[PDB]
Amino acid sequence: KQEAHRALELLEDYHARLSEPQDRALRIAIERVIRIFKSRLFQALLDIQEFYELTLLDDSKSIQQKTAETLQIATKWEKDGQAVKIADFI
Amino acid sequence: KQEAHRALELLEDYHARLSEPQDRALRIAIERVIRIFKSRLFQALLDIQEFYELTLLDDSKSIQQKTAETLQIATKWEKDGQAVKIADFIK
């Protein structure tokens, strides 16, 4: 139970088993959750891809510079639980 | 290539090839990226697990109430997905 790596798998399976017409509104709402979650995951993975490209693959940057940039990215992620993040900002 | 689903794999491979002593500080910094990224993914997965438990598994909630809750969590997560950081507080 509650194997974190399976969380999305289980949500998808719950969706698949929701096949009665009186349950259809819930089914469509869960599809929206699934889409939104996979978009979050995709953006996270692009954070890695963009770091890999801007920093690690750029042979013009010194090891020192690459190290600094590498530390900076992880610090941002580490601080996100205490971050003030404003939806639909100016 | 840049296939998103393999982005962490490629980073793991770069780490593995970064074996010279002058590059060791960068290797250790990359270990920290990998650790922190995995924590981010775990926490995201727990956001699903927590919704699944609280809403979908609770047979005492009507389909209507589960639907309402599911819609609200999508609205919230959509706002979160585009929110911009302005500050963080120590602690």
From Swiss-Prot, chain A:
Transmembrane segments: none annotated. During the cellular blastoderm stage, isoform B, isoform F, isoform H, isoform I and isoform L expression is localized to the cell borders. From stage 11 onwards, expression is found predominantly in the developing nervous system: axon bundles in the ventral cord and the brain. Stage 14 and 15 embryos exhibit expression in the developing body wall muscle. Expression in neuropil regions of the CNS and at NMJs persists through to larval development. Other isoforms show expression in embryonic epithelial cells. It is found in: Cytoplasm; Cell membrane; Basolateral cell membrane; Cytoplasm, Cytoskeleton. Residues 1-60 form the L27 domain. Coiled coil: none annotated. It comes from the Eukaryota. During embryonic development, some isoforms are essential for proper neuronal differentiation and organization. Required for cell polarity; maintenance of apicobasal polarity. Plays a critical role at septate junctions in cellular growth control during larval development. The presence of a guanylate kinase domain suggests involvement in cellular adhesion as well as signal transduction to control cellular proliferation. Belongs to the MAGUK family. This is Disks large 1 tumor suppressor protein. The chain holds residues 5 to 94 of 970 of the full protein.
